[PDB]
Amino acid sequence: NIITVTLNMERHHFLGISIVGQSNDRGDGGIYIGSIMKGGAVAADGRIEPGDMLLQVNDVNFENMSNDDAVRVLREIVSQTGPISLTVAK
């Protein structure tokens, strides 16, 4: 199931999630949601839970990028102002 959420980054200053870098023989395993931190924008919603895979984060899709590159850009987006559109694969 594909879930697209929009988090309010006004009353929040962070996402509050751990990004798991799954790396198999090749390397392309995908980034999954690990631990959720209370007080974060993600914890304020609830649709996202430990195990969800991050596909697209605000237009950019990391489904065809390396685990490192994926979180690299992710952090850059979270380190900015504005509503964050998270597209997770459940």
**Which domains are seen in the chain, by residue range?**
1-90 (2.30.42.10)
d(CA 8, CA 87): 15
Give the contacts of 13 (CB within 8 A, at least 6 positions apart): none
DSSP state of 13: S
Give the residue from 40, 14, 22 showing the smallest Cα distance to 89: 22
Letter string b/e over residues 48-62, b meaning 16 or more CB atoms within 10 A of that residue's CB: beeebbbbbbbeeeb
Q: Which amino acid is at 58?
A: N
d(CA 79, CA 58): 13
Say which experimental method was used: NMR
